[PDB]
Coordinates of C-alpha atoms in Angstrom, one line a residue:
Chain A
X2 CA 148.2 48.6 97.9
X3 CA 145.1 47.0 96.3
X4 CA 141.1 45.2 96.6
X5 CA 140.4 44.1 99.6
X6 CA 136.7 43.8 100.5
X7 CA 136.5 44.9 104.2
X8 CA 133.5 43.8 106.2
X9 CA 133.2 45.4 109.6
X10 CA 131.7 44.7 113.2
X11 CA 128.5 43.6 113.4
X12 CA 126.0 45.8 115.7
X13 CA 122.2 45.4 116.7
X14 CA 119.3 46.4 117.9
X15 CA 116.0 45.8 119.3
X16 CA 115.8 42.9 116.2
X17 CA 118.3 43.0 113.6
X18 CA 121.8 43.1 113.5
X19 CA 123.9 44.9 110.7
X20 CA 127.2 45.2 109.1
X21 CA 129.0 47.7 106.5
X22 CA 131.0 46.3 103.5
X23 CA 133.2 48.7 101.8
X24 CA 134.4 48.5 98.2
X25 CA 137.1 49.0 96.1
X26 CA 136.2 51.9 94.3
X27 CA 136.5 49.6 91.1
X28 CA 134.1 47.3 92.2
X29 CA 131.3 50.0 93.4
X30 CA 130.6 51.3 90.0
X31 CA 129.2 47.4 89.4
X32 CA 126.6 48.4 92.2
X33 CA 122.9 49.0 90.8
X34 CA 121.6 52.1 91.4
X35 CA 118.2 51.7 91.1
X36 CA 117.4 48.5 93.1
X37 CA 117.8 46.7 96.2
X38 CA 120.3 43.2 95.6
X39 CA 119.8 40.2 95.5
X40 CA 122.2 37.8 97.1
X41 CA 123.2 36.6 93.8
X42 CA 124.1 39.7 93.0
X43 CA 126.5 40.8 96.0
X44 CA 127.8 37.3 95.9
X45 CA 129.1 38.3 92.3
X46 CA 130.5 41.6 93.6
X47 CA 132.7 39.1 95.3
X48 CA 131.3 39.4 98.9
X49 CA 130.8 36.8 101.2
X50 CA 128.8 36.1 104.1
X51 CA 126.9 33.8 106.0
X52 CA 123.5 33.0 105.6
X53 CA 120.2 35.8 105.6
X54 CA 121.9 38.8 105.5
X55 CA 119.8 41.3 103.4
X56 CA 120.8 44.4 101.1
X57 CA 118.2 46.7 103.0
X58 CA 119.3 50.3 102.5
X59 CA 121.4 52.7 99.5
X60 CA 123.9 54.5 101.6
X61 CA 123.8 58.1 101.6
X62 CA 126.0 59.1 99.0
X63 CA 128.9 61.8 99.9
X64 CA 129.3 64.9 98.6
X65 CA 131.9 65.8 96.5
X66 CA 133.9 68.9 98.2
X67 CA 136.4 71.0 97.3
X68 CA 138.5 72.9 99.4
X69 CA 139.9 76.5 99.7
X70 CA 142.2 78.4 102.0
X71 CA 143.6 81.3 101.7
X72 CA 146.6 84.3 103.9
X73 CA 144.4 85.7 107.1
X74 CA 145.2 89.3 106.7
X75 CA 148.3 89.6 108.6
X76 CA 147.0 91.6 112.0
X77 CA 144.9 88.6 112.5
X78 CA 147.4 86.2 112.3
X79 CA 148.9 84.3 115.2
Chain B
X2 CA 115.2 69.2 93.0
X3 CA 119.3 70.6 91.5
X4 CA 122.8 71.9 90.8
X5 CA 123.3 74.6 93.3
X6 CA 127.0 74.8 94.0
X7 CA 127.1 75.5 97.6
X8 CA 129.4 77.7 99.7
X9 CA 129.9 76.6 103.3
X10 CA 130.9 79.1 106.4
X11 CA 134.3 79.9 107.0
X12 CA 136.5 78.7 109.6
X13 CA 140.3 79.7 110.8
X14 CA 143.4 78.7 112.2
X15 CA 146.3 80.7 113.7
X16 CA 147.3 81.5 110.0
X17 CA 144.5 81.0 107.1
X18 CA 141.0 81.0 106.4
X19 CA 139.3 77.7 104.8
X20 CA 136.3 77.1 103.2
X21 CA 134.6 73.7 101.2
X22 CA 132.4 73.9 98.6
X23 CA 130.1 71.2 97.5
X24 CA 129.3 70.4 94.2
X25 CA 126.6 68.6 92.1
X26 CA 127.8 65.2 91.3
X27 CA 127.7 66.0 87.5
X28 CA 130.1 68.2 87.8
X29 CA 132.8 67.0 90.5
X30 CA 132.8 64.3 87.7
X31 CA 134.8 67.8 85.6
X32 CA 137.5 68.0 88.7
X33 CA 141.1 66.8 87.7
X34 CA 142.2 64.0 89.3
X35 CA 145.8 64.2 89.1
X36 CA 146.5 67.9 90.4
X37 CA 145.1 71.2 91.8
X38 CA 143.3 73.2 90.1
X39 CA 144.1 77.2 89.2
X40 CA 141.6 79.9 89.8
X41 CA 141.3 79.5 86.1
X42 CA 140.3 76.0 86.1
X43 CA 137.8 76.0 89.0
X44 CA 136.4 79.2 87.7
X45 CA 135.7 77.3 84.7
X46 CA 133.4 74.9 86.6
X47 CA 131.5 77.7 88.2
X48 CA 132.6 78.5 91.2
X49 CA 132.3 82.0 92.4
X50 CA 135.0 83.2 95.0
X51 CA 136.2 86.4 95.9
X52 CA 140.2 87.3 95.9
X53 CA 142.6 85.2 97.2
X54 CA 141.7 81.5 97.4
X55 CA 143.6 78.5 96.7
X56 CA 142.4 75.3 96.1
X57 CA 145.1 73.5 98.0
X58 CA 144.1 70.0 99.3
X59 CA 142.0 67.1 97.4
X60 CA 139.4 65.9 100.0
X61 CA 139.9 62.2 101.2
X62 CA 137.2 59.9 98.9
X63 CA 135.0 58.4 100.8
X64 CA 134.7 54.9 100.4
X65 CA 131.5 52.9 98.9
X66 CA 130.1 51.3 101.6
X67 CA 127.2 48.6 101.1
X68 CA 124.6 48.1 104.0
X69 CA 123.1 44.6 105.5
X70 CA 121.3 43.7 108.4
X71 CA 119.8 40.4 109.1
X72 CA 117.0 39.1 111.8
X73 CA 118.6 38.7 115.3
X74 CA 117.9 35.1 117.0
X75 CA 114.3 35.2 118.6
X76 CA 115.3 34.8 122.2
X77 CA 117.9 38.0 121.5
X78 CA 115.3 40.1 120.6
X79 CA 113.1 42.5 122.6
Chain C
X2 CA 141.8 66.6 130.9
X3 CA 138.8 65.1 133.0
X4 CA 135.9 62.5 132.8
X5 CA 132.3 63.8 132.3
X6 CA 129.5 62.4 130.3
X7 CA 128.1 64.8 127.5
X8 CA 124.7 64.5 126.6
X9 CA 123.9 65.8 123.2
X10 CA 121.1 67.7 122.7
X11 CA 117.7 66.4 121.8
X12 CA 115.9 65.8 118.0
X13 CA 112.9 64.1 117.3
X14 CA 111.2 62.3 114.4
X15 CA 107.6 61.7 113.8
X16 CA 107.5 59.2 116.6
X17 CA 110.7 59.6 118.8
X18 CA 112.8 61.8 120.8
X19 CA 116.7 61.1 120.3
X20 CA 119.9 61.6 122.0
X21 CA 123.5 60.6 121.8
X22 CA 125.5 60.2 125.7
X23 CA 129.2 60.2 125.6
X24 CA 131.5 58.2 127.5
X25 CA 134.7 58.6 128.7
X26 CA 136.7 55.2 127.9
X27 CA 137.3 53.7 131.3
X28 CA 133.7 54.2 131.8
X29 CA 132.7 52.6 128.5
X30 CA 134.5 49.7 129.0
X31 CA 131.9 48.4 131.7
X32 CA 129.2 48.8 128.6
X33 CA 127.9 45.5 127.7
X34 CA 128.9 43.8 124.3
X35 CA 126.1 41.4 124.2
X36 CA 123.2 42.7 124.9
X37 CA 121.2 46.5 125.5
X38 CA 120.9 47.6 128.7
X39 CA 118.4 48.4 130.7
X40 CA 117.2 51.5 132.6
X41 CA 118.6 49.8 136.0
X42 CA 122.0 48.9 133.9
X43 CA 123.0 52.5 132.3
X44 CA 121.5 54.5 135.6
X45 CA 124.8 52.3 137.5
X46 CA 126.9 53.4 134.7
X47 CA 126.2 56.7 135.7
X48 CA 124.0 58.2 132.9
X49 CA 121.4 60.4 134.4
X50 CA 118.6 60.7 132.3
X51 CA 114.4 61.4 133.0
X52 CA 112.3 58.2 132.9
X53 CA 111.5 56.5 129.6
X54 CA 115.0 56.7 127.8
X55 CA 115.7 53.6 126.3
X56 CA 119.0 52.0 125.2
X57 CA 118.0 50.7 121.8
X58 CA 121.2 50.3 119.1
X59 CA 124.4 49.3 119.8
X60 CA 126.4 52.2 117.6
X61 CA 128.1 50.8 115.1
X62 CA 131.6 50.7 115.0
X63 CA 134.4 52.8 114.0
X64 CA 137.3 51.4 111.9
X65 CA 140.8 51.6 113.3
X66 CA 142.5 53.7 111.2
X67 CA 146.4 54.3 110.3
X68 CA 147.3 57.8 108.4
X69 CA 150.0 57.4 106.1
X70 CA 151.8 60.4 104.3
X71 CA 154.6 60.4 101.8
X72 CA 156.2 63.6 100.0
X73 CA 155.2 64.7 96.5
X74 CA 158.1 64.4 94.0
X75 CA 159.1 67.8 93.8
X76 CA 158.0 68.1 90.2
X77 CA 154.8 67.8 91.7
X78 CA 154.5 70.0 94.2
X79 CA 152.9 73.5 94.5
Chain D
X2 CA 147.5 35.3 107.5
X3 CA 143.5 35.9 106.2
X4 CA 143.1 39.6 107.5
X5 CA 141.4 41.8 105.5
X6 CA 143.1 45.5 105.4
X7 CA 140.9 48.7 103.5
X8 CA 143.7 50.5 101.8
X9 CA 141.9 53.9 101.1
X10 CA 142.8 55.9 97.8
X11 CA 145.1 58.3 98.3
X12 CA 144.7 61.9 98.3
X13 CA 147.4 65.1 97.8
X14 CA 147.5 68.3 99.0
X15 CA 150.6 70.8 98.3
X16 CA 153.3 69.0 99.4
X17 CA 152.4 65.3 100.2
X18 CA 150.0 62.7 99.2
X19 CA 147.9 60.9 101.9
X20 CA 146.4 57.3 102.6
X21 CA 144.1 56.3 105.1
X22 CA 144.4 51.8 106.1
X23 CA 141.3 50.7 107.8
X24 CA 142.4 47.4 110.3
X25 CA 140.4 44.6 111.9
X26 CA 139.9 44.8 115.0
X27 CA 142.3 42.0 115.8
X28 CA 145.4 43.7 114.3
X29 CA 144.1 46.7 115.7
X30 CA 145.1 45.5 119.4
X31 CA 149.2 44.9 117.9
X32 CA 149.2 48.5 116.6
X33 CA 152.2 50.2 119.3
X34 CA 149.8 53.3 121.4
X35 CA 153.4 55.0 122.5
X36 CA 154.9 55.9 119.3
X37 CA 154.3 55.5 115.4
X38 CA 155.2 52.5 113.4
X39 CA 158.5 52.6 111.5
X40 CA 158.6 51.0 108.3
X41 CA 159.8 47.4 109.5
X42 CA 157.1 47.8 112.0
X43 CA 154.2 48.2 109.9
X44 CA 155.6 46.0 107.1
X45 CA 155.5 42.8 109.9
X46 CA 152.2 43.9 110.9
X47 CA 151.0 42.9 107.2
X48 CA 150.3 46.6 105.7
X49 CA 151.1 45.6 101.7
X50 CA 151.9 49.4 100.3
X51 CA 154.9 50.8 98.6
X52 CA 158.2 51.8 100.3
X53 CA 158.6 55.8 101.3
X54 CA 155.0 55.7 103.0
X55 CA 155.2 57.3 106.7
X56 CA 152.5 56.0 109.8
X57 CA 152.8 60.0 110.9
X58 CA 149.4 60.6 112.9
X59 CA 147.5 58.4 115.4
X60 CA 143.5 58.9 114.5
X61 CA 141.2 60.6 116.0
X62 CA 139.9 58.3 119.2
X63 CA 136.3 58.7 118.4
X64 CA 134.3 58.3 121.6
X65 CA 132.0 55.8 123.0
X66 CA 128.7 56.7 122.2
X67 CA 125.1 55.1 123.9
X68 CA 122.0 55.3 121.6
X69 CA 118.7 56.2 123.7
X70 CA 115.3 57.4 122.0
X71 CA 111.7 58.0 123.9
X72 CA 108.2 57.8 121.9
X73 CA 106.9 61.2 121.9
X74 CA 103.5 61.7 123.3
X75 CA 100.6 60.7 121.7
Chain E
X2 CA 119.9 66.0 130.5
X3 CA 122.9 67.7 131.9
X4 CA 125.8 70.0 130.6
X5 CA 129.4 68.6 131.7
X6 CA 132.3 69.3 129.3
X7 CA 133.7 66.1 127.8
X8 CA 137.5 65.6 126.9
X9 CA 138.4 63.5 124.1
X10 CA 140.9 61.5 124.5
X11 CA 144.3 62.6 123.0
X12 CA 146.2 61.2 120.2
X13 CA 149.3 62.7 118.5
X14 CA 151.1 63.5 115.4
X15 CA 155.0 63.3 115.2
X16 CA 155.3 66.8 116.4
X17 CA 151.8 67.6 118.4
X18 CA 149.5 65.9 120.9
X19 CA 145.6 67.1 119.9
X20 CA 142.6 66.9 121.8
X21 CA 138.9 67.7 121.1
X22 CA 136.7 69.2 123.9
X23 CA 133.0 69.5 123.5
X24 CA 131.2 72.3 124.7
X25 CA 127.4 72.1 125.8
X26 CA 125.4 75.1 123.4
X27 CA 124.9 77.1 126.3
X28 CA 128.7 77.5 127.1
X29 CA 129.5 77.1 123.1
X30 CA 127.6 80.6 123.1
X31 CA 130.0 82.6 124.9
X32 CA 133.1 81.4 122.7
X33 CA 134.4 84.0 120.0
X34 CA 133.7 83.7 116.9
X35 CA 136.0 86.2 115.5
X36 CA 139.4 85.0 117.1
X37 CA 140.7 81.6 118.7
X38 CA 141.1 82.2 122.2
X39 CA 143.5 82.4 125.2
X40 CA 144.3 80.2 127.7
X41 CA 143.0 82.6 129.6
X42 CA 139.6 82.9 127.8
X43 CA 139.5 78.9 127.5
X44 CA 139.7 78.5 131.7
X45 CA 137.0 80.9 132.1
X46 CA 134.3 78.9 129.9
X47 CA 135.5 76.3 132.4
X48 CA 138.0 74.2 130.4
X49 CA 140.0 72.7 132.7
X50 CA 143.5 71.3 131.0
X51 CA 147.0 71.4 132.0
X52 CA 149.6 74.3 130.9
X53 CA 150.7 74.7 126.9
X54 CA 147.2 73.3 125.7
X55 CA 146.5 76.2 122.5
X56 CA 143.5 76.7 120.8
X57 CA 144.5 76.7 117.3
X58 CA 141.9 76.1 114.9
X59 CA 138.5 77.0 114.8
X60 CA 136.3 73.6 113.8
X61 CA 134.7 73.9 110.8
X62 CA 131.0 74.6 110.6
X63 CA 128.6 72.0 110.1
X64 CA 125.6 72.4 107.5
X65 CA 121.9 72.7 108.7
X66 CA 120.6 69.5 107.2
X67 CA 117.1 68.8 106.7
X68 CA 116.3 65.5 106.1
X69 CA 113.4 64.0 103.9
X70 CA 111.1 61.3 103.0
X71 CA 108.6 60.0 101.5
X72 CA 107.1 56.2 100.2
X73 CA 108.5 54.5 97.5
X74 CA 105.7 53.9 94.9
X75 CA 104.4 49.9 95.7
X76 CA 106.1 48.1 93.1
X77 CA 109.6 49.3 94.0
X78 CA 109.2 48.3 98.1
X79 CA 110.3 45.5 98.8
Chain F
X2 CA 115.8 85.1 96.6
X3 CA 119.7 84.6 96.1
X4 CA 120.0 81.1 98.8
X5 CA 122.0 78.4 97.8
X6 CA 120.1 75.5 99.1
X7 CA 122.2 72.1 98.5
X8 CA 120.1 69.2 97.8
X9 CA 121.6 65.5 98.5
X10 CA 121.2 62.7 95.9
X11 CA 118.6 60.8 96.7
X12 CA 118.9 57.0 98.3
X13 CA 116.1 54.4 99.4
X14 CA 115.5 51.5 101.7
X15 CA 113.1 48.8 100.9
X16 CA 110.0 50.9 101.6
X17 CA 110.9 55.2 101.3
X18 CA 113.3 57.2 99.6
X19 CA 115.3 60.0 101.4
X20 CA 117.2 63.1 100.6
X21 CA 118.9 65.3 102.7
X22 CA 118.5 69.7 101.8
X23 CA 121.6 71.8 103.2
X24 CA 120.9 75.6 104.4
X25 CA 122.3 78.4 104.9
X26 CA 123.2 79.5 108.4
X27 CA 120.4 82.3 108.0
X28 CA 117.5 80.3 106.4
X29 CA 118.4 78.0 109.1
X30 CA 117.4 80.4 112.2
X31 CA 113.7 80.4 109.7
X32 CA 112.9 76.4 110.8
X33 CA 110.6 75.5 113.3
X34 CA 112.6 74.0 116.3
X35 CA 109.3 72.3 118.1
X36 CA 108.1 70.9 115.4
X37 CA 108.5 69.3 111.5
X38 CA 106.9 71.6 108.5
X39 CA 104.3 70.6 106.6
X40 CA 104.7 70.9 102.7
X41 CA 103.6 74.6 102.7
X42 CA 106.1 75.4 105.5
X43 CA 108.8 74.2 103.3
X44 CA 107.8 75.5 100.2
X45 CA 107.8 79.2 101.6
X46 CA 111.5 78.5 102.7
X47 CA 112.5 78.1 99.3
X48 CA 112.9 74.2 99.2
X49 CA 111.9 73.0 95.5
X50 CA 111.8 69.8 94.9
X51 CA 109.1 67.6 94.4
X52 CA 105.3 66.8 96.0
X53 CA 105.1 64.3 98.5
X54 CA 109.0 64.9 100.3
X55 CA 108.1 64.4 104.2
X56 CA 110.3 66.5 106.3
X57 CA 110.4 63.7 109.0
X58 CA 113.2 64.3 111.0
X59 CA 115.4 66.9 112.3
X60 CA 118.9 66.0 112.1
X61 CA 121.3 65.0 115.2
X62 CA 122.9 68.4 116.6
X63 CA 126.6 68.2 116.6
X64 CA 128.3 69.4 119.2
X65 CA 130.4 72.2 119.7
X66 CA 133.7 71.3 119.2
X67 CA 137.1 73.4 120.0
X68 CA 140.5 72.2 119.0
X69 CA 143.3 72.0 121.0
X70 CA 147.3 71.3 120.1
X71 CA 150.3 71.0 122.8
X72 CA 153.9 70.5 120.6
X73 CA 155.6 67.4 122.1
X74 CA 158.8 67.4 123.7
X75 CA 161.9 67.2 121.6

């Protein structure tokens, strides 16, 4: 199944009102890392929006985790 | 500030114990993609575990999310 | 089951005092969409709070997700 | 028609491999609450993945949750 | 404040119907942290559900996150 | 001493820069609850990273969640 920007609900505040975008995995390693965008520059990500919508914020990146399980000893098992 | 590997608190169910541990980005970038790993294998990447565990479940990615907000109209505004 | 509010617990910034209240569905279905509420507004709904708690974002919203699961070919199960 | 579906990437653990499909809000409304979707069903409802994939769990119903803050005292 | 109990609502699986409950930290004090509990152990923190409900699963524990900030140097700000 | 401390990558808005610092369960009983630490404060903990990180918030307590499962009729 394949690269579909999604663009989700807007919500608000007090003033502004914001929206996520998520990304193809693909397409986020064109993403800058060490500036703020343009709207020339999402636009050639391929997003799309109205008018004044501004790149504010780097979300917080995820960790990477790795996970482990292993028997209970048997007399604390249910 | 860097590269701790860290170990969180265990948890149960009826049946096993589970654990994640959370890498430096460097390194999850070592993590096969395409299967689990053997002690052998995760050892190799320096994690530290006692007897026992199995690294049985790749973690869902999380997706790249980009963030906008814009000015709400002035009369929408407090 | 039943149909309380929770209120989380408290956390603070430099400037602010937080908290999170959770409704029960039916109850959150007489939120507005428009526009924040004020003290008079969530009071009706219910929330009981000390004076000077104001309802200032709209939290943004969750996706509506479908899990899919297929089987492993055998070859490459564990 | 123009509805924009997030296919996640999948994951695996032992025995299966896993995909989360994030839905606009819209389609979200046609998804059955009674029962999961059979293959015809999500096919029609415009979910473009390969044959063999199984709608087995409804997601977590994350709750409704009101934002409040106070200024501390100054 | 307060310190009701809130029931999420259910969802299901094809062979399970699961549901979260949230525990002000008072109450979340006085559950075990060494074995899931009886129904019998469940209705006395107050947990008011109908017959066959199990406590299976312990919820895995959530880091102690301290969060940080500081100014961007004046020619990155934007 | 031996603490694992897990620092976040660091991400920025158009006027500050933020990282998150994991603890463990027992350095966490050592933070203030009434109030943020100043750079000493911090330091003592064992938090290295660089001059000038603000602890300026402390972060949303999650609630305390138990998990429950009922097997449906068949």
């Amino acid at each position: 199944a394949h690269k579909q920007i999604y663009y989700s609900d807007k919500y608000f505040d007090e003033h502004y009102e914001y929206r996520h975008v998520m990304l193809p995995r693909e397409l986020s390693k064109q993403v800058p890392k060490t500036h703020l965008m343009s709207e020339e520059e999402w636009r050639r990500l391929g997003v799309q929006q109205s008018l004044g919508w501004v790149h504010y914020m780097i979300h917080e990146p995820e960790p990477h985790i790795l996970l482990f399980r292993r028997p209970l000893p048997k007399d604390q098992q249910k």
